[PDB]
Amino acid sequence: ESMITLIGLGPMGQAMVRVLLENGHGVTVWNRTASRADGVVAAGAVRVDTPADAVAASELVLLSLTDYAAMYDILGKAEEALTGKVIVNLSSDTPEKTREAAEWVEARGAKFIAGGVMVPAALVGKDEAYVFYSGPADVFEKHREALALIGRPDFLGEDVRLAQLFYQAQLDIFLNSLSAFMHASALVRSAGVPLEKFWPYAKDNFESMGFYLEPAVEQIEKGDHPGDEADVIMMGASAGHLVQASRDAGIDVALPEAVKSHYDRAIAAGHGRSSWTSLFEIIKADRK
Amino acid sequence: ESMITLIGLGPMGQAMVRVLLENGHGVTVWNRTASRADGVVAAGAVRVDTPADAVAASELVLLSLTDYAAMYDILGKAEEALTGKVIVNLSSDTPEKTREAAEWVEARGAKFIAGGVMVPAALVGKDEAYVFYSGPADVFEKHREALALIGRPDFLGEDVRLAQLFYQAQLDIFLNSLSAFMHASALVRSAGVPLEKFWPYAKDNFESMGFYLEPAVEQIEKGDHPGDEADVIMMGASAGHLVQASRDAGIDVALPEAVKSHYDRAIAAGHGRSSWTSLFEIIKADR
Numbered sequence: 001e002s003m004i005t006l007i008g009l010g011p012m013g014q015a016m017v018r019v020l021l022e023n024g025h026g027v028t029v030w031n032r033t034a035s036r037a038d039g040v041v042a043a044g045a046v047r048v049d050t051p052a053d054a055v056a057a058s059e060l061v062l063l064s065l066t067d068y069a070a071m072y073d074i075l076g077k078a079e080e081a082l083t084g085k086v087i088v089n090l091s092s093d094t095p096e097k098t099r100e101a102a103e104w105v106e107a108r109g110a111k112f113i114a115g116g117v118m119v120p121a122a123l124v125g126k127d128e129a130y131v132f133y134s135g136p137a138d139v140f141e142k143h144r145e146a147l148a149l150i151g152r153p154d155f156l157g158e159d160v161r162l163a164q165l166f167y168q169a170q171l172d173i174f175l176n177s178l179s180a181f182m183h184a185s186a187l188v189r190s191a192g193v194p195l196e197k198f199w200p201y202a203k204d205n206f207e208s209m210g211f212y213l214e215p216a217v218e219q220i221e222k223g224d225h226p227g228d229e230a231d232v233i234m235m236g237a238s239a240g241h242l243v244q245a246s247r248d249a250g251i252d253v254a255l256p257e258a259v260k261s262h263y264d265r266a267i268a269a270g271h272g273r274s275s276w277t278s279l280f281e282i283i284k285a286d287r288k
Numbered sequence: 289e290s291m292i293t294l295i296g297l298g299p300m301g302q303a304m305v306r307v308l309l310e311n312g313h314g315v316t317v318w319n320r321t322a323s324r325a326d327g328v329v330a331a332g333a334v335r336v337d338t339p340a341d342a343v344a345a346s347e348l349v350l351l352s353l354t355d356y357a358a359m360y361d362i363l364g365k366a367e368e369a370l371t372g373k374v375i376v377n378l379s380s381d382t383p384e385k386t387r388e389a390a391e392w393v394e395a396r397g398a399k400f401i402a403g404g405v406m407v408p409a410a411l412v413g414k415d416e417a418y419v420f421y422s423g424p425a426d427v428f429e430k431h432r433e434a435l436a437l438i439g440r441p442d443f444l445g446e447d448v449r450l451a452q453l454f455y456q457a458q459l460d461i462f463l464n465s466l467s468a469f470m471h472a473s474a475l476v477r478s479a480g481v482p483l484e485k486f487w488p489y490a491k492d493n494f495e496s497m498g499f500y501l502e503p504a505v506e507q508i509e510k511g512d513h514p515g516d517e518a519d520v521i522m523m524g525a526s527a528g529h530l531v532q533a534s535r536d537a538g539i540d541v542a543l544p545e546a547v548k549s550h551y552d553r554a555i556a557a558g559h560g561r562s563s564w565t566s567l568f569e570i571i572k573a574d575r
């Protein structure tokens with residue numbers, strides 16, 4: 001069936017290729033490290049020597065790269081081939097650089113769609129999988145059926161930045177959660193307590209988060225930060241406890257100092273007696 | 289019934305008093321701000337003029353204060369009355385200050401137990417509620433039945449530091465999650481997208497976390513950080529994207545810079561091609 005190019009054979013790239021092949025699609029691939037295509041070439045994919053060859057081979061070109069800098073390095077050696085193609089970039093970078101790259105690709109006569117895949121490689125193509133998409137809807141809809149093999153497509157809008165924004169926002173929560181889990185683990189291991197004793201508590205803590213956060217949405221929407229049940233003076237004190245405990249234990253202080261700086265800036269803005277939601281008032285961009 | 293003293297009548301202390309009263313216990317109370325006892329006095333509690341009076345009124349003295357410094361301010365004006373009492377401190381502070389306070393209380397002839405309450409005031413005494421305790425087990429067991437009204441007691445050990453350590457570790461995850469939620473929200477609101485559109489995704493993200501973290505426990509236990517499915521070079525790049533996006537949006541950069549610094553230190557230690565669990569190797573204390 002339809003031949004699709006994929007450039008970028010990291011684990012996400014490979015999982016996407018395997019899924020396109022298992023559903024009848026032909027897949028041309030190219031990677032900076034050619035040896036990395038062996039597993040997918042064996043499963044039915046066509047390696048090709050040059051980026052220009054890979055772009056020329058198909059209408060739809062998927063990029064699974066570390067960043068957008070890598071797109072310029074790869075497609076920079078394929079500018080003439082781009083005319084009439086559809087670039088779907090499934091790579092992390094800033095929203096601003098996502099729009100700049102859309103303009104560069106369209107100036108070379110291709111369409112540009114941004115994607116953000118919201119599961120790891122092992123879940124590509126399964127039921128859990130979903131992908132943010134943004135860019136021209138007519139073009140997107142022409143290729144929805146193929147893209148949906150990777151995960152449920154969530155088309156956010158024509159502003160090509162939206163998929164990147166949602167990706168970065170989810171990443172913000174995700175990387176924080178990892179670093180916080182490792183930080184808490186580090187504090188525990190520092191005291192000689194095995195992590196198996198703490199895990200059930202950490203697990204419960206993360207599983208309960210949705211409950212503590214749901215009510216906060218309205219408070220943040222409205223600037224309504226009542227402190228009667230928990231205040232920034234009490235929570236900011238705790239944050240300083242965490243910082244001192246971290247110094248005492250010889251573990252990282254960057255993460256707990258960053259969180260303490262939220263409480264300190266809030267106290268300086270007079271929000272001592274407000275809910276922790278008031279931190280939003282010092283974290284948000286100036287409406288000024 | 290049994291008279292228990294609770295000094296510290298903020299949101300959590302009041303919920304504790306209400307629960308002790310609803311179960312027959314008698315409760316003497318005292319606060320730096322006496323007017324704050326009105327609601328609990330009305331529900332059955334006895335206000336008292338002085339800390340010394342509150343300590344003297346009962347065997348078991350619960351303290352729900354903002355920090356341990358407040359314990360010294362309050363019990364500094366008792367001291368003679370402490371002999372033979374049991375102090376259960378349910379306040380945040382450092383583990384080191386928790387041990388220092390146990391020594392000061394025992395030198396004044398009382399027993400000292402540390403607690404960390406793991407639910408907010410509204411859930412005190414409900415099914416969800418649990419509390420870390422640490423200190424002398426015999427003393428703890430003498431008062432277990434009363435303490436259990438506040439939430440499931442988890443005795444961690446006789447090292448009085450353990451409840452505070454577990455409290456601070458849970459707090460680490462908790463305050464991070466809040467700041468991260470607000471930070472992601474801020475990034476979204478900065479671009480003109482309403483929070484209502486993003487919430488379902490944020491919710492799903494937190495609900496999924498337990499699944500992505502369970503396998504990481506073994507990796508951290510063993511120093512086994514395979515990068516085949518996701519590595520620090522790719523995730524570190526992402527963390528830098530978040531930092532740049534945050535500058536672009538004019539939101540806080542402290543939180544994302546802190547997270548990026550984990551990926552940078554890991555790359556510097558050669559863990560570019562390792563799993564994100566390798567950040568543990570940079571975050572941990574020198575062995």
Ligand SMILES: NC(=O)c1ccc[n+]([C@@H]2O[C@H](COP(=O)([O-])OP(=O)(O)OC[C@H]3O[C@@H](n4cnc5c(N)ncnc54)[C@H](OP(=O)(O)O)[C@@H]3O)[C@@H](O)[C@H]2O)c1
Binds near residue numbers: 012013031119
């Ligand atoms: N892994 C995950 O679970 C996951 C999940 C969600 C989203 N993502 C996103 O998915 C994308 C891919 O991540 P991944 O883990 O599959 O792969 P990765 O480790 O970022 O590598 C992906 C590809 O980028 C290539 N590459 C990087 N810089 C390049 C450059 N300057 N020029 C040419 N090629 C370059 C690599 O080529 P080489 O093979 O030659 O090194 C590789 O083929 C990232 O943007 C990431 O944020 C990752």
Ligand SMILES: NC(=O)c1ccc[n+]([C@@H]2O[C@H](COP(=O)([O-])OP(=O)(O)OC[C@H]3O[C@@H](n4cnc5c(N)ncnc54)[C@H](OP(=O)(O)O)[C@@H]3O)[C@@H](O)[C@H]2O)c1
Binds near residue numbers: 231296300354355378
């Ligand atoms: N609130 C929650 O949802 C929650 C969740 C679990 C655990 N905790 C922990 O529970 C503890 C109690 O905090 P809270 O939220 O109930 O309220 P809080 O704002 O910490 O106030 C608690 C009490 O401390 C007293 N206090 C503070 N500094 C004092 C000082 N220097 N001298 C004398 N009294 C002093 C206050 O008396 P005044 O009336 O004079 O201020 C107040 O009655 C904290 O350590 C907190 O970390 C909180």
